[PDB]
Every structure is written in structure tokens, then in C-alpha cells.
Coordinates of C-alpha atoms in Angstrom, one line a residue:
Chain T
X12 CA -40.2 25.7 -7.6
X13 CA -37.3 23.6 -9.0
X14 CA -37.1 19.8 -8.4
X15 CA -33.8 18.8 -6.7
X16 CA -30.5 19.1 -8.7
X17 CA -26.8 18.9 -7.8
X18 CA -24.5 21.9 -6.9
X19 CA -20.9 21.0 -7.4
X20 CA -21.0 17.8 -9.6
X21 CA -17.3 17.8 -9.6
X22 CA -17.0 16.7 -6.0
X23 CA -19.3 13.8 -6.8
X24 CA -17.3 12.0 -9.6
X25 CA -15.7 9.7 -7.0
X26 CA -17.8 6.6 -6.6
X27 CA -15.3 4.6 -4.5
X28 CA -13.6 5.8 -1.3
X29 CA -11.3 4.0 1.1
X30 CA -9.9 4.6 4.6
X31 CA -7.9 2.7 7.2
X32 CA -10.0 1.9 10.3
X33 CA -10.4 4.3 13.2
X34 CA -10.4 7.2 10.8
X35 CA -13.2 9.5 9.9
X36 CA -15.4 9.5 6.8
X37 CA -17.4 12.5 5.4
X38 CA -19.8 11.8 2.5
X39 CA -21.5 14.7 0.7
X40 CA -24.1 15.4 -2.0
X41 CA -24.2 19.2 -2.4
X42 CA -27.8 19.8 -3.6
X43 CA -30.2 22.6 -4.4
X44 CA -33.8 22.8 -5.5
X45 CA -37.0 24.7 -4.6
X46 CA -38.3 24.2 -2.2
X47 CA -35.4 23.1 -0.1
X48 CA -34.9 19.4 -0.9
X49 CA -34.5 17.0 2.0
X50 CA -31.6 14.5 2.2
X51 CA -31.8 10.9 3.3
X52 CA -29.1 8.2 3.7
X53 CA -29.4 4.5 2.9
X54 CA -26.8 1.8 3.7
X55 CA -26.9 -1.0 1.2
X56 CA -30.5 -0.3 0.2
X57 CA -31.8 -0.3 3.8
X58 CA -32.6 3.0 5.5
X59 CA -29.6 4.2 7.5
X60 CA -30.6 4.9 11.1
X61 CA -28.5 6.3 14.0
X62 CA -29.0 3.0 15.9
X63 CA -27.2 1.2 13.1
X64 CA -23.5 1.9 13.8
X65 CA -22.1 2.4 17.3
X66 CA -22.2 6.1 18.1
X67 CA -24.5 6.8 15.1
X68 CA -23.4 9.6 12.8
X69 CA -24.0 13.3 12.2
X70 CA -25.6 14.9 9.2
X71 CA -24.5 18.5 8.2
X72 CA -27.8 19.5 6.5
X73 CA -26.3 22.8 5.7
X74 CA -23.5 21.0 3.8
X75 CA -25.5 17.9 2.7
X76 CA -23.0 15.6 4.4
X77 CA -22.9 12.4 6.2
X78 CA -20.2 12.0 8.9
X79 CA -19.1 8.8 10.5
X80 CA -16.4 9.0 13.3
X81 CA -13.8 6.3 13.8
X82 CA -15.3 3.9 11.2
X83 CA -15.1 0.3 12.0
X84 CA -15.0 -2.6 9.6
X85 CA -18.7 -3.2 9.9
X86 CA -19.1 0.2 8.3
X87 CA -18.1 -1.3 4.9
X88 CA -20.7 -0.9 2.2
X89 CA -22.7 1.3 -0.2
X90 CA -24.0 4.7 1.0
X91 CA -26.8 6.1 -0.9
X92 CA -28.0 9.7 -0.4
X93 CA -31.5 10.6 -1.5
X94 CA -32.3 14.3 -2.1
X95 CA -35.9 15.3 -2.6
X96 CA -38.7 17.9 -2.6
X97 CA -42.4 17.3 -3.4
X98 CA -41.5 17.8 -7.1
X99 CA -38.9 15.1 -7.5
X100 CA -35.9 13.3 -6.2
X101 CA -32.3 12.4 -7.2
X102 CA -29.6 10.2 -5.6
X103 CA -26.0 9.1 -5.6
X104 CA -24.1 6.3 -3.9
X105 CA -20.5 5.9 -2.6
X106 CA -18.8 2.7 -1.8
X107 CA -16.9 3.0 1.5
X108 CA -14.1 0.4 2.0
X109 CA -12.6 0.2 5.5
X110 CA -9.1 -1.2 5.6
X111 CA -7.4 -2.9 8.6
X112 CA -3.6 -2.5 8.7
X113 CA -1.7 -5.5 10.0
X114 CA 1.6 -4.0 11.5
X115 CA 3.4 -7.2 12.4
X116 CA 6.5 -9.2 11.3
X117 CA 5.8 -11.3 8.3
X118 CA 4.2 -14.7 8.6
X119 CA 4.9 -17.4 6.0
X120 CA 2.5 -20.0 4.6
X121 CA 3.3 -23.3 6.3
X122 CA 4.9 -26.1 4.3
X123 CA 6.7 -23.7 2.0
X124 CA 9.4 -24.0 0.8
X125 CA 8.8 -27.8 0.3
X126 CA 11.6 -30.4 0.1
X127 CA 12.6 -31.4 -3.5
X128 CA 14.5 -34.1 -5.4
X129 CA 16.0 -34.0 -8.8
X130 CA 18.3 -35.9 -11.2
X131 CA 21.7 -34.2 -11.5
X132 CA 21.2 -31.7 -14.3
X133 CA 17.5 -31.3 -13.8
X134 CA 15.6 -28.2 -12.7
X135 CA 13.7 -27.3 -9.5
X136 CA 12.2 -24.4 -7.6
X137 CA 11.5 -23.4 -4.0
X138 CA 8.4 -21.3 -3.4
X139 CA 7.7 -19.4 -0.3
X140 CA 4.4 -17.5 0.1
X141 CA 4.5 -14.4 2.3
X142 CA 2.0 -12.4 4.4
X143 CA 3.1 -8.9 5.3
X144 CA 1.3 -5.5 5.2
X145 CA 4.5 -3.5 5.5
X146 CA 6.7 -4.1 2.5
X147 CA 8.6 -7.4 3.0
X148 CA 12.2 -8.1 2.0
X149 CA 12.7 -11.7 1.0
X150 CA 16.1 -13.4 0.9
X151 CA 17.1 -17.0 0.1
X152 CA 20.0 -17.9 2.4
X153 CA 22.1 -21.1 2.0
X154 CA 25.0 -22.7 3.9
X155 CA 28.3 -22.6 1.9
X156 CA 32.0 -23.1 2.3
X157 CA 35.0 -20.7 2.5
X158 CA 38.4 -22.2 1.9
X159 CA 37.5 -25.8 2.7
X160 CA 36.2 -24.7 6.1
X161 CA 32.4 -25.0 6.6
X162 CA 32.6 -22.5 9.5
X163 CA 34.1 -19.2 10.3
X164 CA 36.5 -18.3 13.2
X165 CA 33.6 -17.3 15.4
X166 CA 32.1 -20.8 15.0
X167 CA 29.1 -19.6 13.0
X168 CA 28.3 -20.9 9.5
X169 CA 29.3 -19.1 6.3
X170 CA 26.1 -18.0 4.6
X171 CA 25.5 -17.1 1.0
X172 CA 22.5 -15.1 -0.2
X173 CA 21.3 -16.8 -3.4
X174 CA 18.5 -14.2 -4.1
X175 CA 16.9 -11.3 -2.4
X176 CA 14.2 -8.7 -3.1
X177 CA 15.0 -5.7 -5.3
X178 CA 14.9 -4.1 -8.6
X179 CA 16.4 -7.0 -10.4
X180 CA 14.0 -9.6 -9.2
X181 CA 10.4 -9.5 -10.2
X182 CA 9.7 -12.4 -7.9
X183 CA 11.7 -13.2 -4.8
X184 CA 9.0 -15.6 -3.5
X185 CA 10.2 -18.2 -6.0
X186 CA 13.7 -19.5 -6.4
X187 CA 14.5 -21.5 -9.5
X188 CA 17.6 -23.7 -9.7
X189 CA 18.5 -24.6 -13.3
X190 CA 20.9 -27.4 -14.2
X191 CA 21.2 -28.7 -10.7
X192 CA 24.7 -29.7 -9.9
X193 CA 25.3 -32.2 -7.2
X194 CA 26.7 -29.5 -4.9
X195 CA 23.2 -27.8 -5.0
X196 CA 22.0 -30.4 -2.6
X197 CA 21.5 -29.0 0.9
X198 CA 19.1 -26.8 2.9
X199 CA 17.7 -23.6 1.3
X200 CA 16.5 -21.1 3.8
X201 CA 13.8 -18.6 3.0
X202 CA 13.9 -15.5 5.3
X203 CA 11.4 -12.8 4.9
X204 CA 11.6 -9.6 7.1
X205 CA 10.0 -6.2 7.3
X206 CA 10.8 -3.2 9.5
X207 CA 9.0 -4.9 12.4
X208 CA 10.4 -8.4 12.4
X209 CA 11.3 -11.4 10.4
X210 CA 10.4 -15.1 9.9
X211 CA 12.2 -18.0 8.2
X212 CA 11.5 -21.5 7.0
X213 CA 13.5 -24.0 5.0
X214 CA 13.3 -27.0 2.7
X215 CA 15.8 -29.5 1.3
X216 CA 17.1 -30.3 -2.1
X217 CA 18.3 -33.8 -2.9
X218 CA 20.2 -34.4 -6.1
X219 CA 20.0 -38.1 -7.2
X220 CA 23.3 -39.2 -8.7
Chain R
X6 CA -9.7 -8.8 1.9
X7 CA -6.2 -10.2 2.6
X8 CA -4.5 -10.1 -0.8
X9 CA -3.1 -6.7 0.2
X10 CA -0.6 -8.4 2.5
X11 CA 0.7 -10.4 -0.4
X12 CA 3.6 -10.6 -2.7
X13 CA 7.1 -9.4 -3.1
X14 CA 6.9 -7.0 -6.0
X15 CA 3.5 -5.3 -5.4
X16 CA 1.3 -3.4 -7.7
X17 CA -0.5 -0.7 -5.7
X18 CA -2.0 2.8 -5.8
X19 CA -1.2 5.3 -3.1
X20 CA -4.3 7.2 -1.9
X21 CA -3.2 10.3 0.1
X22 CA -5.0 11.3 3.3
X23 CA -6.0 14.3 1.2
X24 CA -8.0 11.9 -0.9
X25 CA -5.6 12.0 -3.9
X26 CA -3.9 9.2 -5.9
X27 CA -0.2 9.9 -6.2
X28 CA 0.7 9.8 -9.9
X29 CA 3.8 10.4 -12.0
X30 CA 3.3 11.7 -15.5
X31 CA 5.4 11.2 -18.6
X32 CA 6.8 14.7 -18.3
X33 CA 8.5 13.4 -15.1
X34 CA 6.4 15.7 -12.8
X35 CA 4.9 14.2 -9.6
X36 CA 1.3 15.1 -8.5
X37 CA -1.8 13.7 -7.1
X38 CA -4.9 13.0 -9.2
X39 CA -8.4 12.5 -8.0
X40 CA -9.5 10.2 -10.9
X41 CA -9.8 6.5 -10.5
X42 CA -8.4 5.6 -13.9
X43 CA -5.4 7.7 -14.5
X44 CA -2.9 5.0 -15.3
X45 CA -0.1 7.1 -13.8
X46 CA -1.2 6.2 -10.3
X47 CA -0.5 2.5 -10.8
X48 CA 2.7 2.3 -8.8
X49 CA 5.0 -0.7 -8.6
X50 CA 6.3 -0.9 -5.1
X51 CA 9.4 -3.0 -4.4
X52 CA 11.8 -3.7 -1.5
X53 CA 15.4 -2.6 -2.0
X54 CA 16.2 -3.3 1.6
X55 CA 14.5 -4.1 4.9
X56 CA 12.0 -1.2 5.4
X57 CA 13.2 0.6 2.3
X58 CA 11.4 0.6 -1.0
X59 CA 11.4 1.9 -4.6
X60 CA 8.0 3.2 -5.8
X61 CA 7.7 3.2 -9.6
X62 CA 5.0 4.8 -11.8
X63 CA 4.5 1.6 -13.8
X64 CA 3.5 3.4 -17.0
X65 CA 5.6 6.5 -17.3
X66 CA 8.6 4.4 -16.3
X67 CA 9.5 6.9 -13.5
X68 CA 10.7 6.1 -10.0
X69 CA 9.1 8.3 -7.3
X70 CA 12.1 10.2 -5.9
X71 CA 13.4 13.0 -3.7
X72 CA 16.4 15.2 -4.4
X73 CA 18.7 16.4 -1.5
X74 CA 17.0 19.8 -1.8
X75 CA 13.6 18.3 -0.8
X76 CA 11.5 18.2 -4.0
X77 CA 9.6 15.3 -5.4
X78 CA 10.5 14.2 -8.9
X79 CA 10.7 11.0 -10.9
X80 CA 13.9 9.8 -12.6
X81 CA 13.9 7.1 -15.3
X82 CA 17.1 5.7 -13.8
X83 CA 17.0 4.3 -10.3
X84 CA 19.2 6.3 -7.9
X85 CA 19.5 6.9 -4.1
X86 CA 16.9 9.7 -4.4
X87 CA 14.5 6.9 -5.1
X88 CA 15.0 4.9 -1.9
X89 CA 12.0 5.6 0.3
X90 CA 11.6 4.4 3.9
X91 CA 8.1 2.9 4.2
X92 CA 6.5 2.9 7.6
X93 CA 2.9 2.3 9.0
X94 CA 1.7 5.2 11.2
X95 CA -0.7 4.7 14.1
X96 CA -3.6 5.7 11.9
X97 CA -3.5 2.9 9.4
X98 CA -1.9 5.2 6.8
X99 CA 1.7 4.8 5.4
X100 CA 4.5 7.4 5.2
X101 CA 7.3 7.4 2.7
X102 CA 10.4 9.1 3.9
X103 CA 13.6 9.8 2.0
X104 CA 16.1 7.2 2.9
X105 CA 19.0 9.6 2.2
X106 CA 18.3 13.3 2.4
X107 CA 17.2 14.9 5.7
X108 CA 17.2 18.5 7.0
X109 CA 17.4 20.4 10.3
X110 CA 17.8 16.9 11.7
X111 CA 14.2 15.9 10.9
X112 CA 13.2 13.7 8.0
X113 CA 11.6 14.8 4.8
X114 CA 8.4 12.9 3.7
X115 CA 6.8 12.4 0.3
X116 CA 3.6 14.5 0.6
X117 CA 0.6 16.1 -1.3
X118 CA -1.2 19.2 0.0
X119 CA -4.8 20.2 -0.1
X120 CA -4.9 20.1 -3.9
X121 CA -2.7 17.3 -5.2
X122 CA 0.3 19.6 -5.1
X123 CA 3.8 18.1 -4.3
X124 CA 4.9 19.5 -1.0
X125 CA 8.5 20.5 -0.2
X126 CA 10.4 17.9 1.7
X127 CA 11.9 20.4 4.2
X128 CA 8.4 21.6 5.0
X129 CA 6.8 18.2 5.5
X130 CA 6.3 16.4 8.8
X131 CA 5.8 12.7 9.7
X132 CA 2.7 13.3 11.8
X133 CA 1.2 15.8 9.4
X134 CA -1.7 14.3 7.5
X135 CA -0.2 15.7 4.3
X136 CA 2.3 12.7 4.3
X137 CA -0.1 9.8 4.9
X138 CA -1.0 7.3 2.2
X139 CA -3.3 4.4 1.9
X140 CA -1.6 1.8 -0.4
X141 CA -4.3 0.2 -2.5
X142 CA -4.3 -3.2 -4.3
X143 CA -4.4 -3.2 -8.1
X144 CA -4.8 -6.5 -10.1

């Protein structure tokens, strides 16, 4: 008559588990012991009842598992299993984190970039905070000139990309301008875009003579 | 909970649907660990172009990459076998497809099997759970 003990301790080394919403989670605590130890589940200390999460859950006694279908964010928390027989009891807890993916074009923090002023020769930067689940591609565009003409034959402006995201830039969200020359004055556009869409906001640089 | 939607260069971990953390070890080889500490799962995801990224094993200085043949591998130097096409599937998971190499018309995806084993590009499928990954914040 052995008090409860674990079967495959290997499959119980993971304390943290994450999944995007609407997916399925299966928690397990393979146990043995004589007589047959019972299994109980707690959610954040409190007893875990079927009436707790919409659609309850299923327990595979034969597998010592807890199964939650199409987890929702409210399913976030600690899940403690309690195995026991009259001669003793052991437990283990997993921390389930439910993630919610935001598949939209980026959205930028308002007010950034912010307008700036600087004595010719001074320094300045233009920040631009970004929110995007899908990897965002940042690019600082500015209006420039080509052969003394501010515009092209199609009537659209000539644009220059002062800095974009990539392997050479550890931080495209910031754009430092060192030794500001007078010609640096003007509008600095910040355009962030991901495979879904893009967004863009600007600021101004004024160089005091 | 939002800081996962933040930043240009992003330090993340890629947890496969098969509950593995994609890692790239010093020997160059790509595989998925189940540990939570293996510092070869700390990837450095960066955008090379709209919708296209470069995943880098931050410690073993290796870029996750795919050769025209269809096999995962990590080169120290960044090349076009490193450009991955990142996309969010309808199940909250991400898929990383080769930006260059294709086959039989379909696309080849970065993927781990039942036991952290690097799948063969040609044999992978976008919708097949083998190629799904939950990017995870590291800070």
C-alpha cells in the first residue's frame, strides 16, 4: 500500500506553459500509488469546479490529465493538481498563460515624434513608439530635392529614407540627428508598417540660426 | 500584458505548437528544446522588410535559415536563406516561411516535429501544426 508518487517525472519539469487564445490545453500529473490515488485540481488555490469556466473541462483519470477546450483569457492562472490516497498526498502546479494575438496594422503612440528646435550644429532625436503584434518595419521618410526641383515629373514629392528597420539598426524607433545643419530643418515622417497595414505620423525640426 | 506588441528589434523565444522552444546551438544545428533556460532559445527577431524578418539565436550568433534544398540551419553570416516571412495564422500562432526557396509551388515552413526535430522544408505545410510558433517576450 504505497502512498502516491509520480510516474514520468520528466513530463513534469515544465512549470510554465503558454498558448494563444481559442486553443486547447491539456495538463497532466502521471501518478501511481497503492491504493489508486485520486486526483484533484485547484485553480489559484481555490477548488476547480466545472461551473468555473464556460463549458467546464474534462479529466482523463486514466491519464491523470486536465483538459480545457478553447481557453479564454479568464483561464489565466495557476493550476494545481492534488494526487492522494489515504496514506498520503503529493501535488504539482502549472502556470497557464493565455495570449491574445492582435493581427492589425500598427498603431503609434500619439504625440510622437514630437516637434524639436536646435541651434545649428546641435543634436536632436525623433522618437516614435510602436504597437504591433506582427513584426513592424519602421522607416523615417523625409522630403528632399533632386536637381533643384522639389517635385518629380509625376507631381509627387521626392522622398528620402533616412533610416529603416534592419540588421544595421538596433533601434529604428529613435532617429538621432547629429551636428544639425540648417538644411536639416523640415518635416520628419515616421512610417511603421507590417504585412497587414501601416500608419504614419510626423514632427518638425527647426534649426535656429 | 501588452509589451509583446512593442519594439523594433525584439528579443523573443519561439514556442512551437509541439511545446518546444526553437533553439540554435553553437554547433550551428537547429532544434527545439523543452527547457525554459537553454540560452539558445533567446532569439533576436528583426525586420528586414515589410512582413519579412531575420531570426537570430542571440547567443550562438546564428541566424535561423533555410537552404534552397529545404533544411533548417544557422549561418553566422546573414544571407537570403535567413529571410523569413512572418505571418499570424488564424489560431494565434505564427508561421515562418522561407522568403526565397519554395517547392512544387507551395511554400516551405520552419518547423519542429513531435520531438524537437527540424522538419524538412519540402515536407512542411502552412496549416500543419508542426509549423506554428508562439513568440514569447524575453526581458
